[PDB]
Amino acid sequence: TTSAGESADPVTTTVENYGGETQIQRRQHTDVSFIMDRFVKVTPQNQINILDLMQVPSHTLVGGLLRASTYYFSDLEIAVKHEGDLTWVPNGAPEKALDNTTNPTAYHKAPLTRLALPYTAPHRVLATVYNGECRYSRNAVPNLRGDLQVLAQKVARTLPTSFNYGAIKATRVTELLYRMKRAETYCPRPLLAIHPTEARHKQKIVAPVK
């Protein structure tokens, strides 16, 4: 079909335009709740770990797809391999609270601890990217204009301190995995495949035996 390309109104043609037939599609696997709901390993800190979803590497399935949203919501599960007992403290806690056992503490039971945690941030939703500051006592943020170069001022910014699901602490934490529960994603952002050197990106794919 011809259309006005400048418009931005989505145009979806079908193989019927030249005598084919559109088939049925079952899209259960590209549903945000389902695909986000699997564990992903993170490299832990020896002892204090603040629970921050932006810790999962950007190349992973969950890191890739979490960064393709601007704002998101979820509850959380973690599974942790640790020495001693594991204490978790909600968003907003003083870090010295990590040492008090009335705060949710799980006693060591081999091989690991898996916990269901609530969303505790003070915000209706959290963001993978945030164009601003949370420290007050500063000078105002500039209203930047210019080309892409102008965006290099922002690289030393850390995401607001309120963007976390609390923190956990144990004597040694050896392994940490996150799993997003009931996930919601808003405002898509770029998702990048590997860029090939060749005409086609080629990989050894799993094939029979000999």
């Binding site: 109104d9 043609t13 079908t14 335009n17 709740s33 389902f34 709901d37 269901a116 969303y119 505790t120």
Partner: protein, 46 residues
């Protein structure tokens, strides 16, 4: 509703297993993908 597949109800209350949501007072991209022009803009011969 994500990747969960148990046929019996949770031993714990929903107030415990998950945060509870509140109201004040798919969605956009579903509506957007449904709204797509699927036709033809010419006149069709044969």
């Amino acid at each position: 509703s994500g990747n969960t597949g148990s046929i019996i109800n949770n031993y714990y209350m929903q107030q415990y297993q998950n945060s509870m949501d509140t109201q004040l007072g798919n969605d956009w991209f579903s509506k957007l993908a449904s709204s797509a022009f699927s036709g033809l803009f010419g006149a069709l011969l044969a």
